[PDB]
Structure 1
Amino acid sequence: MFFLKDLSLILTLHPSYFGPQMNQYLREKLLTDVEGTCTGQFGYIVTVLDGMNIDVGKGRIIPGSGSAEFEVKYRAVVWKPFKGEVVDAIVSNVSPIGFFADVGPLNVFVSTRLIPDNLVYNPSNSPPAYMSNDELITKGSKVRLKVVGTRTDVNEIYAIGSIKEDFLGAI
């Protein structure tokens, strides 16, 4: 789910960049170091609002190392999945152990043990799919799934979905 959050970043600048263009350079450095990153605490930062008018304040010189430390506060759009949430998805891969879907930047893996039994995996089909009499879910097929668990990594998030309840599966 997408949100607006007020975040802050600590930026350290080498003395070789102490020029008139210091502020703009700090802005592009912030944009390059925040746009697209993935933090387990917050999720995924997709964009920074008002990216060219961010206040940086006054940097403090670190005693003994010369480099200046800047405290940058900004508002950004953040997306983070939650346990027990039902969202739309697009299937990216089909495999005997289960199928992998994509919910924005997040890639969700659904095991066969969380798939209804009638959706038997068909490897002979082109492309291979988990199909039933009235349902056929393959690569590129819209699916509505509920996120059950989320795994936190260093700079990545792994989520597990399920389609075993009602109003789920193919859409």
Structure 2
Amino acid sequence: MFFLKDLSLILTLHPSYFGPQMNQYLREKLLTDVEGTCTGQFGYIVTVLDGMNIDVGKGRIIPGSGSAEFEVKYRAVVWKPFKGEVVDAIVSNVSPIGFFADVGPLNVFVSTRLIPDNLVYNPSNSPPAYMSNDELITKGSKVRLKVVGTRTDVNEIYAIGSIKEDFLGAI
């Protein structure tokens, strides 16, 4: 599920920053605009590999003002959940409607309707949990879930899923 896709970015640069160590500023600004972004198109941009040899190529000077346009071509480590995909994360929260889990930079939520019936939502328990004929789930506990659907959002991609199939749940 984690990938290493070869992307690129464009940054306009004011003439001020036209010093001797410019390569440097573009690079550091690159990072400020990529590492931490999130598009349903490309997923979660989390880390830029091989910094050192980043590629800048010559940049062109926009005619009106003075800025230079650079097409920085790098490569980075990303992660974007797919439907039907199966992974497991640490349970993060938990209400009457289900519980949310955290797989990496993500948060997938499981509905009380997407669990095995014999596992009911615990009333006054701390921290609020779920009881099975044998199992018990809370914040801490580790769960392996299946991502049914995915909703692309702001600068975060959340999704939903169930543990109603087999080989899913606690471990």
> Shared fold (TM-score greater than 0.5)?
yes
Q: 1:135 maps to what in 2?
A: 135
Q: Which string of whole-angstrom CA distances, capped at 9 and with x for unpartnered residues, describes residues 88-136 of structure 1?
A: 1110111001101101011111111111111101122222111112111
Residue 35, structure 1, aligned to residue 35, structure 2: yes
Moved beyond 3 Å, runs of 4+:
none
Matched residue of 1:51: which SS? coil
CA distance in 1 between counterparts of 2:29 and 2:125 reads 49
| Distance in structure 1 (CA, Å) of the matches to 2:126 and 2:18 | 60
- Is the deviation greater in 121-130 or in 26-35? 121-130
The structure with the greater share of residues assigned to strand is 1
Offset at 1:52? 2.3
User: Could you report, residue by residue, the CA deviation over 1:3-31 in whole angstroms, capped at 9, with x for unpaired residues?
Assistant: 11100101110111111111011111111
> Counterpart of 2:164 in 1: which secondary structure?
coil
Does structure 2 retain, via aligned residues, the 8 Å contact 1:40–1:157? yes
Contact between 1:147 and 1:160, CA under 8 Å: does it hold in 2? Answer: yes
CA apart distance, 1:72 = 0.5
What value does the CA root-mean-square deviation take over the aligned residues? 1.0
TM-score, structure 1 normalization: 0.96
C-alpha distance in 1 between matches for 2:100 and 2:123: 15
- What is the DSSP-based 3-state SS (H/G/I as helix, E as strand, rest coil) of the residue aligned with 2:50? coil
Normalising by structure 2, we get a TM-score of 0.96
Per mean C-alpha deviation after superposition, the further-off stretch among 32-41 and 22-31 is: 32-41
- Distance in 1 of aligned mates of 2:118 and 2:149: 24
* 2:113 partner SS: helix
CA contact (8 A) 1:48 1:74 kept: yes
Q: Provide the C-alpha distance between the structure 2 equivalents of 1:9 and 1:99, rounded to a whole number of angstroms.
A: 37
Q: Residue 10 of structure 2 corresponds to which residue in structure 1?
A: 10
Percent identity over paired residues: 100
SS at 1:113's partner residue? coil
3-state secondary structure, aligned to 1:64: coil
2: CA distance, partners of 1:122 / 1:92 = 16
User: Does the CA-based 8 Å contact 1:120-1:130 persist in structure 2?
Assistant: yes
Give SS of 1:60's match. strand
| Equivalent pair of 1:5/1:76 in contact (CA under 8 Å) | yes
Query: Contact 1:40–1:155 at 8 Å: present in 2 too?
Result: no
Return the alpha-carbon distance in structure 1 between the equivalents of residues 102 and 154 of structure 2. Answer: 20
Describe how 1:70-149 pairs up with structure 2 within 5 A: 70-149=70-149
How far has the Cα of 1:149 moved from its partner?
Answer: 0.6
Task: Verify the 8 A CA contact 1:31 1:51 in the aligned structure 2.
Answer: no
